[PDB]
Curated annotation (Swiss-Prot), chain A:
Medical condition linked: Microcephaly and chorioretinopathy, autosomal recessive, 3: A disorder characterized by congenital microcephaly and chorioretinal dysplasia associated with poor vision and nystagmus. Variable ocular anomalies include microphthalmia, retinal folding, retinal detachment, optic nerve hypoplasia, absence of retinal vessels, round areas of chorioretinal atrophy, and attenuated electroretinogram. Most patients have mild developmental delay and mild learning difficulties.
GO cellular-component term (any): membrane
KW RNA-binding (keyword) present: no
Protein name: Gamma-tubulin complex component 4
Keywords per UniProt: Cytoplasm, Cytoskeleton, Intellectual disability, Microtubule, Primary microcephaly
Full protein segment contained here: 192 to 657 of 667
Subcellular localization(s) per the UniProt record: Cytoplasm, Cytoskeleton, Microtubule organizing center, Centrosome
Subunit comment: Component of the gamma-tubulin ring complex (gTuRC) consisting of TUBGCP2, TUBGCP3, TUBGCP4, TUBGCP5 and TUBGCP6 and gamma-tubulin TUBG1 or TUBG2. TUBGCP2, TUBGCP3, TUBGCP4, TUBGCP5 and TUBGCP6 assemble in a 5:5:2:1:1 stoichiometry; each is associated with a gamma-tubulin, thereby arranging 14 gamma-tubulins in a helical manner. Gamma-tubulin at the first position is blocked by TUBGCP3 at the last position, allowing 13 protafilaments to grow into a microtubule.
Cytoplasm among keywords: yes
Annotated tissue distribution: Ubiquitously expressed.
Organism of this sequence: Homo sapiens
GO BP, one annotated term: cytoplasmic microtubule organization
From Swiss-Prot, chains C, D:
One GO CC term, this protein: pericentriolar material
Name of this chain's protein: Tubulin gamma-1 chain
Underlying gene: TUBG1
Modifications made to the protein after synthesis: Phosphorylation at Ser-102 by BRSK1 regulates centrosome duplication, possibly by mediating relocation of gamma-tubulin and its associated proteins from the cytoplasm to the centrosome.
Source species of the chain: Homo sapiens
Compartments it resides in: Cytoplasm, Cytoskeleton, Microtubule organizing center, Centrosome; Cytoplasm, Cytoskeleton, Spindle
Phylogenetic classification of the source organism: Eukaryota, Metazoa, Chordata, Craniata, Vertebrata
């Protein structure tokens, strides 16, 4: 109830605080020990009638001539549920979490994708080169030129977004990232741990966005190039590389807008705050699990498909004539690997892939593969 | 709460701030345009005794059309150096004065106004001397030839650079830095809030951090003064001067750009100096 | 990335105004082109508010409406006029292009049957490909001496317009059965609904589909197969709306199989059960597909205008659309044997023969080569 | 520094009257020239209140107005009458000149549409350069045998007046559109508004531009290119004002680029965003400037009359003003072939054709030399 621990010899089992197990009593279960560690830190960080009455309860236990654990919890859990109810009141109503989560979904998870296709359109040449000590500022301006380019005018939450360049510990895109200076109230909900797994999603989701925006520009040229019996192999490969990518870019609006719609529903349901720290935590773990980022085999096979399109799209853009000067000689290289990589993936999916493989197999084309 | 309230509703702390700005920071026109205009009419032993400079102020306040209040007094127009003898420097201070219950808040060091003042006055020396050559050439008008029209285009090309650097100052040190500290106030805080309002010296390019940006300004201001000396017997002597002006200005645009990577205040400068050019 | 819209002919200028009064109503835009108080990205169609329109007798009818501040009959006759006002209109078009930041496409509304459309619409498509070569030109053309104007125009739309047909016969039919009208002023109400929902995903910030390329590239695989069809069901779950799309009783049309499907949902349906709906559709096998190439069925979500319940629009690429061409070209041959060079109308019949051939050959297991 | 006005012809005496009404309304000055009870320096225009007016038929009705206590058709005939009263009228000017402390300029309100004042305007400017060579003169001329009287006064205005054009044609377009008049006293309501706000920085003290030479010296680059146009948007933040000013729908005028702009804001708007609006105008590239010298746009703030909402004035020097002259002089050549020496009309046509050459030469990247 006072957030401080009166101790100068490391006696009590608590020593940003932590918990102690090598000194914790025997008959006390760890479950209530965790409950104690939370009910206090929620006061020390936080800096009426809900204060004195509990003091009478604790004092009452001191009169009991026999330590009854079955009662020790009925006083702890009420204290726990009261501060949790009091904390949820602030973490949602006073300090609006919905507005803040709405910011994270837009920028971290590419929710506002329309801002990034312009930022990619501008800050492109300055990242294919290896990174140096100056590129960190060369992009923060381009990102700032972007938000104004989409008529988004808001001096709030604009300087809070600072792109980072992991330099000196190599293509520039591989080190790109976005950090977020969190405010004071949500400092407990968004630790450097949870705010890091978010970044990994932004790294991957941007890549698929980069290759897709790149790939379709080539289509904007093939159709444009309407005025060779072998040049037609391009679109017969482009569309193959398109459907696998575009629909892979689906299941994303239906894993984000579906997992998110649960995370927001678990919030407005439980008056308790302890659920939010777990509902949000499970929401994050699902994205790493559903989006196949943790599944190594698929993530190490589709990755080959990613950089594969970079080569093909460049091949069509690096010229304006038919594929004769060893381009066709380079063209048939990838199809022997791509189509091999294509059906290689097919055996992998044959829990969560059911939502994905269904879309690619709508016409049973891979069934003929 | 009763201590702070005692200051506003009884001793007019809100008035003193919005009054010293009228006089020191030269916000009130028809006063700087009348003080600087008088002093610049003269230019040694003259213009230094308390009979002219201690009296030019009492002649200036009459042409202010704003003031002549108990606040308007206590404008000691003193000096801090004895000049011996084309440059852009004329050292002269202008110190406000207060009494006991207000002296404890407005620090005797917050001396820094005198730091930002001598710059702002130096700026007026351009818009008057440059106005002179614009007015000195008017009486020359029959005399229409390539040597004439090509000459006047230099003034329009040099004036615009001063009329844009001034428009910057009239935006940072008088309006946006005044938006803060006016909607910020509404006893210890008054000391720090004031120490944060003036600390006007950061957006004013007077800080030693961005000092190289200020050093280049003198090269610009100096060449305009030389342009005033040659009020077409020596046209080519002036043609070389303008070409030096176009080089230094073209060098400023690069030194400010290189200093963007390392200050959001300077960001608005490049948008001012550069607009549809490089 | 903005889209400049052009409107030609009486039918084109009429549908556009009804498309404009519909669009500005979905937003908080007063008829005086001023925002009313009362997130919705409005930059794609409006310039900072003015719509990026170029309208080309009926103009008087538009300026008499309270929306005033919003801004012969032979094929040979229409074309001759075009070359005479060649320079006059392009300065109107060019100045709008330079005014836009990054112009992307060209929406055109015109009717092949309409004389002015059959004369002036055809001329622009050749000039538009000449001046600006890297800009897509998509048209909302609408099928109805009458066969002549139609086939001569189709000769241009198959090589110039890289991308939707609206048949008045089916529209007049739908008017009787489910609307019970019997005029032009009533059927246009439903026309505006199609064009509006066609560009829903662009006017609201989403995850993908943030450009006109984001919709068309998945539909058109080859420069020849570039004809689409629309379907508007509501005249409630996600599985409910799809079963009404595939019924030919609502598609405005009069072996055969599709190429790719794009589904647009404007409701607030739970996005979790959409993957359940697709599974039952593949089980029922309600639509036939192509076996040669990989294709999939797509679906997208958006938000209805709040200032104005589930709607639905589908984009279909069917080979049955070739029959409508045959009917027209059949009547063309009928008038050819009954009645300066008379040669241009001869080559036009030959080039459209390739188009109908490409679709009839597309429904074979050996469409390639 | 005091300013004095002169009003000639029927037009100048009319708009100057309403100019005196609106200005007298800004300050707490009763119609009877007496201050009522109810900061603003009222000494530049008023002299202890007495306005420094000089009025040269309608004058009878002017004294019949409640503001009484506030004080042929050819060009050569208008020039002759000015010579017959050379000394008689001039005494009023002199006695008002040195009786004033320090004269700064001479505001001239007159019309050039064939009136006796139009010639009367030509004469005064010749003598104003004769007697006082150190006194600026500004004139708010207004544009419509009418070609004759118009082109002649242009010969004097280009070498005497060191500095605002207003064409009735572009004014009436504003009248029918946003006031719906379908009169003379109706359009001048807006005209007086332009002049009133034109001297907002003079009657109210500010930091920059505290004198009539403070406004003109920046815009006019050479004594020849000395023509200005105006803009007045309120008929809401800073980005709303400047964007509505640059539109050709608001300009009071019937390649091409700007030389200098001046925007006067009269509201209490938040000055923190004035730099942001400057960024968005640059990036969208909504206006085009000269290529040779660095040309910018300047803005200054002031305060409205507290007795009487965000207003704004736009002052510009656009080389498109050359087109207006071409409309005039073209009519002259047509009237030159259709109808004591007729030699003055020659040099007049000669000198303006030098000016029309001077504008067209300013738009080239090599205007120097």
């Amino acid at each position: 109830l006072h957030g401080l621990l009166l101790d100068q010899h490391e006696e009590f089992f608590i020593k940003q605080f932590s918990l102690r197990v090598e000194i914790l009593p025997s008959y006390i279960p760890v479950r209530v020990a965790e409950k104690i560690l939370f009910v206090g830190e929620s006061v020390q960080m936080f800096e009426k009638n809900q204060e004195d009455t509990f003091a009478a309860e604790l004092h009452r236990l001191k009169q009991q001539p026999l330590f009854s654990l079955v009662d020790f919890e009925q006083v702890v859990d009420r204290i726990r549920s009261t501060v949790a109810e009091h904390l949820w009141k602030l973490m949602v109503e006073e300090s609006d979490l919905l507005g803040q989560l709405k910011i994270i979904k837009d920028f971290y998870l590419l929710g506002r994708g329309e801002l990034f296709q312009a930022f990619i359109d501008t800050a492109q040449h300055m990242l294919k080169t290896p990174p140096t000590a100056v590129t960190e500022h060369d992009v923060n301006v381009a990102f700032q030129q972007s938000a104004h380019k989409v008529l988004l005018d808001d001096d709030n939450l604009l300087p809070l977004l600072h792109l980072t360049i992991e330099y000196h510990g190599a293509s520039g895109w591989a080190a790109l990232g976005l950090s977020y200076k969190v405010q004071w109230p949500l400092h407990i909900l968004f630790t450097p741990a949870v705010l890091e797994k978010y970044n990994v999603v932004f790294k991957y989701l941007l890549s698929v966005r980069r290759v897709q925006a790149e790939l379709q520009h080539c289509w904007a040229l093939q159709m444009q190039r309407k005025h060779q019996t072998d040049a037609i192999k391009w679109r017969l490969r482009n569309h193959m590389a398109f459907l696998v990518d575009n629909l892979q870019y689906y299941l994303q609006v239906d894993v984000l807008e579906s997992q998110f719609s649960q995370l927001l529903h678990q919030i407005n349901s439980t008056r308790d705050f302890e659920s939010i720290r777990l509902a949000h935590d499970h929401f994050l773990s699902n994205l790493l699990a559903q989006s196949f980022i943790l599944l190594k085999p698929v993530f190490h096979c589709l990755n080959e498909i990613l950089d594969l399109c970079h080569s093909f799209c460049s091949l069509v853009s690096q010229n304006l004539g038919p594929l004769d000067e060893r381009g066709a000689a380079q063209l048939s290289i990838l199809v022997k690997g791509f189509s091999r990589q294509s059906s290689l993936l097919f055996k992998i999916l044959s829990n969560s892939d059911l939502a994905q493989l269904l879309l690619r197999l709508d016409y049973n084309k891979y069934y003929t593969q | 709460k009763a201590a702070v309230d005692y200051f506003f509703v009884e001793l007019h702390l809100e008035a003193h701030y919005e009054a010293l700005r009228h006089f020191l920071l030269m916000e009130d026109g028809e006063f700087a345009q009348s003080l600087s205009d008088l002093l610049f009419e003269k230019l040694p032993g003259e213009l230094l005794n308390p009979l002219v400079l201690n009296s030019v102020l009492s002649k200036a306040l009459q042409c202010s059309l704003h003031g002549d209040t108990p606040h308007a007094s206590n404008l000691s127009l003193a000096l801090k150096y004895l000049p011996e003898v084309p440059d852009v420097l004329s050292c002269l201070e202008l110190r406000y004065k207060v009494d006991w219950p207000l002296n404890i808040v407005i620090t005797e060091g917050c001396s820094k106004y005198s730091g930002v003042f001598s710059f702002l006055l130096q700026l007026k020396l351009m818009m008057w001397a440059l106005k002179d050559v614009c007015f000195h050439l008017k009486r020359t008008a029959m005399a229409g030839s390539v040597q004439f029209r090509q000459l006047q285009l230099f003034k329009h090309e040099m004036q615009h650079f001063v009329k844009v650097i001034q428009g910057y100052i009239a935006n940072q040190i008088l309006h946006v830095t005044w938006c803060e500290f006016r909607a910020r106030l509404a006893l210890e805080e008054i000391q720090r809030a004031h120490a944060e309002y003036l600390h006007a010296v950061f957006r004013g390019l007077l800080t030693e951090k961005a000092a190289p940006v200020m050093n280049v300004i003198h090269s610009i201001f100096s060449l305009v003064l030389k342009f005033r000396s040659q009020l077409h017997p020596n046209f080519a002597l002036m043609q070389q001067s303008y070409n030096t002006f176009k080089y230094y200005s073209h060098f400023l645009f690069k030194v400010v750009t290189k200093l963007v990577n390392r200050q959001p205040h300077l960001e608005d400068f490049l948008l001012r100096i550069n607009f549809n050019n490089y | 990335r903005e889209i400049i819209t052009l409107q030609l002919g009486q039918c084109g200028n009429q549908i556009g105004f009804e498309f404009w009064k519909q669009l500005c109503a979905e937003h908080g835009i007063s008829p005086e082109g001023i925002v009313e108080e009362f997130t919705d990205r409005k930059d794609v169609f409006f310039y900072q508010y003015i719509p990026r329109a170029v309208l080309l007798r009926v103009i008087h009818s538009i300026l008499n409406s309270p929306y005033a501040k919003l801004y012969g009959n032979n094929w040979a006759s229409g074309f001759s006029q075009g070359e005479k006002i060649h320079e006059d209109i392009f300065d109107i078009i060019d100045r709008e292009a330079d005014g836009s930041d990054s112009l992307e496409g060209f929406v055109l509304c015109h009717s092949i049957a309409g004389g002015t459309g059959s004369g002036l619409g055809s001329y622009l498509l050749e000039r538009l490909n000449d001046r600006y070569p890297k800009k897509l030109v998509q048209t909302y053309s609408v099928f109805p001496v009458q066969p002549y104007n139609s086939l001569l125009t189709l000769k241009r739309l198959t090589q110039n317009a890289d991308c939707v047909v609206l048949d008045n016969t089916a529209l007049n039919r739908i008017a009787t059965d489910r609307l019970h009208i019997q005029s032009f002023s009533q059927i246009n109400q439903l026309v505006s609904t199609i064009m509006s929902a066609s560009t829903t995903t662009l006017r609201y910030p989403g995850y993908m589909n943030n450009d006109l390329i984001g919709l068309i590239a998945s539909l058109i695989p080859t420069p020849r197969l570039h004809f689409l069809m629309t379907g508007y069901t509501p005249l409630t779950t996600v599985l409910d709306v799809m079963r009404r799309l595939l019924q030919p009783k609502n598609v405005m049309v009069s072996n055969h199989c599709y190429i790719a499907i794009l589904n647009i949902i404007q409701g607030e349906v739970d996005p979790t059960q959409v993957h359940k709906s697709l599974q039952r559709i593949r089980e029922r096998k309600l639509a036939n597909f192509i076996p040669w190439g990989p294709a999939s069925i797509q679906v997208a979500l958006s938000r209805k205008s709040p200032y104005l319940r589930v709607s639905g629009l589908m984009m279909a690429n069917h080979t049955s659309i070739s029959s409508l061409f045959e009917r027209t070209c059949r009547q063309y041959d009928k008038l050819r044997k009954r009645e300066d060079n008379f040669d241009e109308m001869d080559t036009s019949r030959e080039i459209v023969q390739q188009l109908i051939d490409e679709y009839h050959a597309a429904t074979r297991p050996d469409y390639i080569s």
